[PDB]
Each structure stands twice: as C-alpha cells, then as structure tokens.
Design a protein around this ligand. Sequence first.
Ligand SMILES: [Cl-]
Ligand SMILES: [Cl-]
Ligand SMILES: [Cl-]
Ligand SMILES: [Cl-]
Ligand SMILES: [Cl-]
Ligand SMILES: [Cl-]
Ligand SMILES: [Cl-]
Ligand SMILES: [Cl-]
Ligand SMILES: [Cl-]
Ligand SMILES: [Cl-]
Ligand code: NA
Length: 129
Amino acid sequence: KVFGRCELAAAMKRHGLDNYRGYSLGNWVCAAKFESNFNTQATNRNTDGSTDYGILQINSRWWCNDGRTPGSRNLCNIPCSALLSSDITASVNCAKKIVSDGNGMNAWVAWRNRCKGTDVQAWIRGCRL
Ligand SMILES: [Cl-]
Ligand SMILES: [Cl-]
Ligand SMILES: [Cl-]
Ligand SMILES: [Cl-]
Ligand SMILES: [Cl-]
Ligand SMILES: [Cl-]
Ligand SMILES: [Cl-]
Ligand SMILES: [Cl-]
Ligand SMILES: [Cl-]
Ligand SMILES: [Cl-]
Ligand code: NA
C-alpha cells in the first residue's frame, strides 16, 4: 500500500506513535517519507546482506526474521514479511522497540540526515488529527 501523507499520519497516531519517546508525529512521517516514500512494500538490501522492510525500513540484522541474514536477531519476534502489510501495526510496534534502544530516532540514518533539526511539523500540516 502507498499511503497518503495525512493518511499515514493518522494511522501512526491511532497506533500510538505520536510523541512516542518524545518524537512528534511529523518526525515519524518525515522518516517514513525518506525511508519508503510511504510504500509499505518497500524492501532494500544492505551492504552486509541484511534487508530493510516496510514503511520504516526495519532491518533484519536485529529486528525481524527473513531466514537469510546470518547471525542476526529477531528482537520484534516477527517475520520480516509482516512489515510489508497494508496494516502498519507490526511496523509501528517494532519501531517503538527500535526507538527505545538507546539512540532514539538516530537508528534511522535517513531521519538523522534528512529530518532531524528540520521543520518536521510541515509533514502533518493540514491533516485532520
Ligand atoms: Cl501500491
Ligand atoms: Cl492522505
Ligand atoms: Cl509527501
Ligand atoms: Cl510534528
Ligand atoms: Cl536469518
Ligand atoms: Cl532474537
Ligand atoms: Cl519468522
Ligand atoms: Cl494501518
Ligand atoms: Cl531520544
Ligand atoms: Cl538506517
Ligand atoms: Na533477523
């Protein structure tokens, strides 16, 4: 599913991501924009042989099982395919664990490089919330 911007903002809020660990909703929408362009089916292979999955590009090195990432963990206790669903529940629940792991949203390199310190409220402007 390719979400609309305000549609995703609303879905993230319903799932408790707004202000989670202190990160406003616009931070999460901005991260999803640059990670996946709001496409739940996005996948990308990493240099190390892990793969990133879904709207927030969650990585099989630590967070999900894809059967092909040697030595990896599955800390969200999910198949990586769950992160590709039109329903964002699994991605949101796993993102909550990731952002709690110590480095906040810096876990998403694209958030650090493209969202952090910017006017992230622009990403939710106009949306009914
Ligand atoms: Cl599509
Ligand atoms: Cl929308
Ligand atoms: Cl957009
Ligand atoms: Cl915001
Ligand atoms: Cl594996
Ligand atoms: Cl594990
Ligand atoms: Cl699995
Ligand atoms: Cl959803
Ligand atoms: Cl933080
Ligand atoms: Cl990353
Ligand atoms: Na894994």
